[PDB]
Amino acid sequence: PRRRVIGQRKILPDPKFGSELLAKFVNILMVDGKKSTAESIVYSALETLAQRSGKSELEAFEVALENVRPTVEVKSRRVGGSTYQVPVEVRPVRRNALAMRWIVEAARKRGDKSMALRLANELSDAAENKGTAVKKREDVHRMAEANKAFA
Amino acid sequence: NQYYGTGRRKSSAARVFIKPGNGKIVINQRSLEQYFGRETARMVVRQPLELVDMVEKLDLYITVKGGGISGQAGAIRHGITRALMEYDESLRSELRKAGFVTRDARQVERKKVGLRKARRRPQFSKR
Amino acid sequence: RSLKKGPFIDLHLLKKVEKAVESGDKKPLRTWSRRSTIFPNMIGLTIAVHNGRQHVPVFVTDEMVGHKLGEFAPTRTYR
Amino acid sequence: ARIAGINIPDHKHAVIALTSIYGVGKTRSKAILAAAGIAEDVKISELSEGQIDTLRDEVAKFVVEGDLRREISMSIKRLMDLGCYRGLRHRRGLPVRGQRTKTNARTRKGPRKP
Amino acid sequence: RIRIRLKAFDHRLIDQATAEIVETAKRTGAQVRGPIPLPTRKERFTVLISPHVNKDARDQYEIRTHLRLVDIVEPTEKTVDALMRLDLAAGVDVQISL
Amino acid sequence: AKQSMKAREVKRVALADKYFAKRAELKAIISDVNARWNAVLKLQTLPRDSSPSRQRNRCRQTGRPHGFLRKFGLSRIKVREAAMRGEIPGLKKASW
Amino acid sequence: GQKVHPNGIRLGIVKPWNSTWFANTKEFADNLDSDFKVRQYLTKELAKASVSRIVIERPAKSIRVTIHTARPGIVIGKKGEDVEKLRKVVADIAGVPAQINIAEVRKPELDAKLVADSITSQLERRVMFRRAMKRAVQNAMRLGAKGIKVEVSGRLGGAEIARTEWYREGRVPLHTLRADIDYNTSEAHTTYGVIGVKVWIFKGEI
RNA sequence: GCGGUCCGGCCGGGAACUCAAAGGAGACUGCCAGUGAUAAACUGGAGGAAGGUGGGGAUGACGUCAAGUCAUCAUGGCCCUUACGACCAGGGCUACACACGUGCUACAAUGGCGCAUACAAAGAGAAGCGACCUCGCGAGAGCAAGCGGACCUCAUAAAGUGCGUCGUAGUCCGGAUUGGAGUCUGCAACUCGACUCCAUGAAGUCGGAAUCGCUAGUAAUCGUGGAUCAGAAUGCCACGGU
């Protein structure tokens, strides 16, 4: 992508609750393209998220997400042989977009005994924000802002 | 009177018959979920009915084979909508905004001579 | 495990395992059919096999009833 | 549940545990539980010393335990003493069954050094 | 009753030979079942073009097989007759057997 | 391509049928589940080259033991040699 | 070394096959080898005859063969003399009967294999190769023709350096499938190695 | 949509639909708007199955590297010539203290293994594919119908979906290896094949420096056929699921 600035591939909404954002995640979690077994651990790992948190359900995901949505970040550059890395705010769409990569990334490590569980304990670990994601929402808040003098 | 439309997608071609009866459906002589109507392709078939009314308004006899699941189902959704035109062209107008009319060009790319498969370029040493 | 049903040997060699039990077993044999097996009607025989260079001598002992006639004749030499 | 060999394999299902002995595999893990009036998904957590002492007298047919430790070893020395080829390898540290060796051949050699 | 699997390599020559067997059968005889296309067997062969090494080169070739069915329902002594002898057109294959 | 290596196949061909196959059929009903009498696997000392595999198939205009296709008979390079000039009927550059 | 054969690619269009027939795998090769076995010999016996193309067609267990040449006269003999002897042997290869065509070639100046051979002899006749190509092109444009280009390669006029001179004139759309382009090699052996002459002659539109 | 069913499109029957293969039509920034000279063009919209070379091939300019190929082959010169030629048998290339390269398989629960059962496209075939029944646990062997083939065989596709075992533990993972016991083609398989079957189970619990591929139905994951071929592909060529 040099002269040609593209756009975005708005993906099909959710096949049950009906939602975009919802979907993106479903894929984020998918691997090797097993979208079936994937969403088979999506809604199933979201069933107990409509029970323990209790807060409705359609938003039992959203609200918990707001705890992993940064507003500034980093980026490598190279000006004269150094790095002069200058932070920046994450685009409205890229913001929550990132949020999901991590929330799950915490499930990619949290070695329990069952994925669906290695998923909820963190999404719920967002209600009272204290998981490897909300705290991951700190490695950038701390990394960046420190070199904010260049912003 | 009988109603129909073809509709196909990625080697999965299907034939769809609308019969003013009930939401009930029988694709390839075997009830909905009695085939695949629950997998990823859940209410996928309903979709072409979302922006309209049914439930017990119109029955339908479906027929498809060749390819894969989500693929077949696609054609289904295609036929259904390009068969649902009969009531009028006025609905196909508001049914296009759901791009259900669009035939999916998407198709498997041929594996050229040189790559491991389509786009995958075999790794070469450092330099 | 290989030759389906029933072992295999030579003909220009069989006139030497059968002709070794009646005329007294003489000096080692010199053919080129390692492919043959070890029939109990050879036991003791002075067998040898040309493998690249010369013929390596061996003694058809006891319990060796179902094994080739070449494994005992390494052609590749190293060290 | 020592049974047959001194090995005390336990705390594992029927068709499961059983395959712990040297000479007991999947195949011969049902060929016995199907000729003694015993089930499969059964955990010894309810096995009377009676439905076992009968499963113990079964293994007594095909060479296992130490018997097999020197049973196959019997042919080990044999094939070697013969002075053939298939025996040469073992008494050397090289793959028997004709495998190549311009490179890989570690399973029958040993972790590289130089 | 009488099948006629006519096969060739050029599309506009296989159905220009059929365009005859028919205009003949529907002449000295009749019935016929119009021409029936039939699947096309395209057999490709991928080969290396460099006289030595250079695998990623290659020249992909292919030969196309076009079919015709004809299938005459009502034979004719006058039709099964002239049928033979006259045929012309070099390069096409004819098969009426059962 | 070594007139010699060429004739080696011609002798493996003229010897595979005038002998093997013709009498090589002496290993089917004969050498199978028929019962054993030694008459079987014994008179097995015919030619050698005469065999249904003792061959390599070689270009009819050169003799390159590799890249030889039956459908055309010739070898890849000699094939293309033709290809681009009609030479091989209904054969052209594929694409799709 | 990176250009496709003009003819062989146009095979799906403008330029037709040279071997028109059909067979089965079972005996496709035995036919192919059968076919291109007649060419080899028929060409030889007609060297000084100015040949340029030999079309073979097998009409079901049989054979026709159309011989092309701008020089047909002395390819037949005294009212059928020569052609006869040819057919004879011709048939005696495959195993089936034989007949043979006799196609003339009005204007050899534009035919590929002709202008290509019309030089391979020039070279072995120790003539100024840079005069052969200049010849060709000109008297090739002379009578019609839209495009024409000749190429030569190997020890030219004597050398230890392998050079390849070309020479175009007019207009030659080698990349336009629908353009009628006739191309033909033509090797010539001299006292010091082989030489290569590859011609290209553009003639028409659609 | 029609009638008869031993409910198998099985048999009348029907050309509609799928598909088959010939000839058409269509997309050209053509329309609207914006930016940009009122230009070209890019952005967005409409209609449209498809937009903005729709996707994918084929196609690779004058030329560069006295690149590679004189073992495809042809070829100037050179050399051998009762000979580095040539006939035969056996043996190496499948050897191996090793480093490197491209790979297949893993290191597991978004996964092993057991039962049940739902969907490919593409391709080949007669000195071939070889049902069905039948013998073995199985690889196979017997009887042999059909098919030079949208008619028959090769394939009942795999992931997948519904329960079931398991519990994150080198373990029910992973499969090297060694022995024993068997299958297939061949004159003949020990050095050297391919496959099944019974026991055995390392290393690896995901990888430093560094680095490779990929911007779409693509990467990854999943099976399928094919060329050569007597027989031996994780290789190559081609296909198609998610």
CSV table of C-alpha atoms in Angstrom, one decimal, chain A residues 10 46 78 126:
chain,number,residue,atom,x,y,z
A,10,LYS,CA,-17.2,-4.5,6.8
A,46,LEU,CA,-20.6,-16.2,26.4
A,78,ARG,CA,13.9,6.0,12.5
A,126,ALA,CA,-12.7,-6.7,32.8
